[PDB]
Design a protein around this ligand. Structure first.
Ligand SMILES: Cc1cc2nc3c(=O)[nH]c(=O)nc-3n(C[C@H](O)[C@H](O)[C@H](O)COP(=O)(O)OP(=O)(O)OC[C@H]3O[C@@H](n4cnc5c(N)ncnc54)[C@H](O)[C@@H]3O)c2cc1C
Ligand SMILES: [Mn+2]
Length: 455
């Protein structure tokens, strides 16, 4: 990366906001995944959208790759600079604007995390529900198409993103649904917002997201329920969904995951396949939901439900399951699967995944959003054991292909990044791949928008 180019970057954002130091680049060369990569050639912190546009235009016209960087909590290598280039850390743009409580909407810049937003919203009676376990950038969550434990009731990022401000690869500024617009539905033209949700930084740089807010629940009840088997817990889940109980959260942990969370969070749940449950409503609706849900879990051998402060500990332990799993083997890294299947096929593939983890030498914990037909196998890898990393990636791809055989998808929320590009080709086929690539090419003709990811 030439000195003239670095000085041009500094002329846009200011000398303090450009770094070519090795340690700073290495800190921005990875996410929470096991993926490695060479670091970016520079890290740049634009201070406003005009600067984002000018940095993008400078890189694009000079043939320098651009890697958008939020909070670096992704798990598929999205920020790994496989082709070098400029890592654009967007988190100094950290303002909440256009809070429209009467319309249930708000606009956030990339430095705003969900934590920050919901702190800003207490006493409003509103909240933002999509809850990845990590303290992630909300714009990064829009970029990855994130979901979380609340999605079964309150939707994913795709359901809750109403508008996006995007700096396109050559610097142009796009408001996907129109500048300042927010509304419940539209048929006006082609929906551009949905194209950029889940684009992972390969189609442009999200510099603000317009989010749907939700009313806080009247009352909340959380519980855990222990089961004799994985089959029993997942059958209960499928039957709760088929009975149309509007559960707020329904999270599965196998016995391995439960034990790991116990050890990492000082929970003391019985070590067993377990559902973490949460219910929202009035006292009347809560009592109705509880007895219909307890009736189903009892059918499948579930324990009597183990009912402010304790639920916060419950869901904090769940949100930290990724780290609880890593703590089972200190020094290891992790790779998560993320298949999502038609719900009636979820018992088969979870039970099969449990059996396959047992029959293998790998350490795996099972957790996730089974209300969506989605789950994670968190597989531990020794960073220096090349045999084990080979066997983990083979395990992940076999699981992904089993989900595709069942009519499902290889990723419910994490994205493709570096890890699932072959699975994506199988999932959507040659015409799906070419169509996605044609969309990538019209927005990023020179292929400099986070190269090597997704496609
Ligand atoms: C403990 C833990 C729990 C997690 N739980 C969940 C979960 O329940 N659900 C879930 O969906 N994910 C989960 N994640 C994954 C991760 O938090 C999400 O994928 C999150 O959306 C990533 O946001 P980020 O800003 O940290 O991403 P980064 O790692 O910074 O970037 C991710 C990708 O998006 C791109 N990108 C980032 N910001 C922008 C932007 N502003 N514009 C354009 N492209 C951008 C990057 O180029 C990259 O390709 C978890 C991660 C951890 C560590
Ligand atoms: Mn998840």
């Amino acid at each position: 990366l030439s000195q003239d180019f670095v000085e041009a970057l500094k002329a846009v954002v200011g000398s303090p906001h450009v770094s070519t130091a090795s340690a700073v680049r290495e800190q921005h060369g990875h996410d929470e995944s096991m993926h490695r990569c060479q670091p970016p050639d520079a890290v740049v912190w634009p201070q406003n959208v005009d600067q984002v546009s000018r940095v993008a235009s400078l890189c694009y016209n000079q043939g320098v790759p651009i890697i958008p960087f939020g909070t670096g909590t992704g798990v598929e290598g999205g920020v790994c600079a496989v082709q070098g280039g400029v890592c654009i850390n967007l988190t100094h743009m950290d303002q909440i604007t256009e809070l429209n409580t009467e319309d249930f909407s708000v606009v956030v810049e990339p430095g705003v995390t969900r934590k920050a937003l919901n702190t800003h919203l207490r006493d409003s009676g509103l909240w933002f529900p999509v809850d990845p376990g990590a303290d992630a950038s909300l714009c990064g969550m829009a970029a990855t198409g994130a979901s979380g434990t609340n999605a079964v009731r309150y939707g994913t990022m795709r359901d809750n993103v109403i508008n996006l401000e995007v700096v396109l690869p050559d610097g142009r500024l796009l408001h996907t649904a129109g500048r300042g617009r927010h509304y419940r539905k539209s048929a006006a033209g082609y929906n551009l917002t949905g194209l950029f949700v889940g684009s992972e930084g390969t189609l442009g740089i999200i510099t603000s997201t317009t989010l749907r807010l939700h009313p806080a629940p009247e009352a909340t009840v959380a519980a855990t329920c222990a089961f004799p088997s994985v089959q029993a817990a997942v059958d209960s889940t499928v039957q709760i969904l088929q009975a149309a109980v509007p559960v707020a959260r329904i999270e599965f942990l196998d016995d391995v995951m439960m034990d790991a969370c116990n050890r990492h969070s000082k929970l003391n749940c019985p070590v067993a396949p377990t559902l973490f449950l949460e219910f929202h409503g009035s006292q009347q609706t809560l009592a109705e939901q509880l007895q219909r849900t307890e009736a189903i879990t009892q059918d499948n051998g579930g324990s009597h439900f183990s009912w402010a402060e304790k639920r916060n500990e419950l869901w904090a332990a769940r949100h930290n399951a990724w780290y609880a799993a890593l703590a089972l083997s200190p020094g290891s890294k992790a790779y998560s699967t993320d298949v999502c299947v038609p719900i009636s096929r979820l018992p088969e593939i979870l039970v099969e995944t449990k059996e396959e983890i047992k029959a293998s030498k790998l350490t795996g914990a099972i957790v996730g959003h089974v209300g969506d037909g989605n789950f994670h196998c968190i597989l531990l890898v020794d960073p220096d054991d090349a045999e084990e990393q080979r066997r983990v990636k083979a395990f992940a791809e076999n699981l992904g292909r089993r989900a595709l055989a069942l009519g499902g998808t290889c990723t419910g929320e994490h994205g493709i990044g570096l890890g699932k590009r072959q699975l994506l080709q199988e999932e959507v086929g040659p015409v799906g791949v070419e169509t996605m690539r044609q969309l990538k090419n019209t927005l990023d003709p020179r292929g400099l928008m986070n190269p090597g990811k997704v496609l």
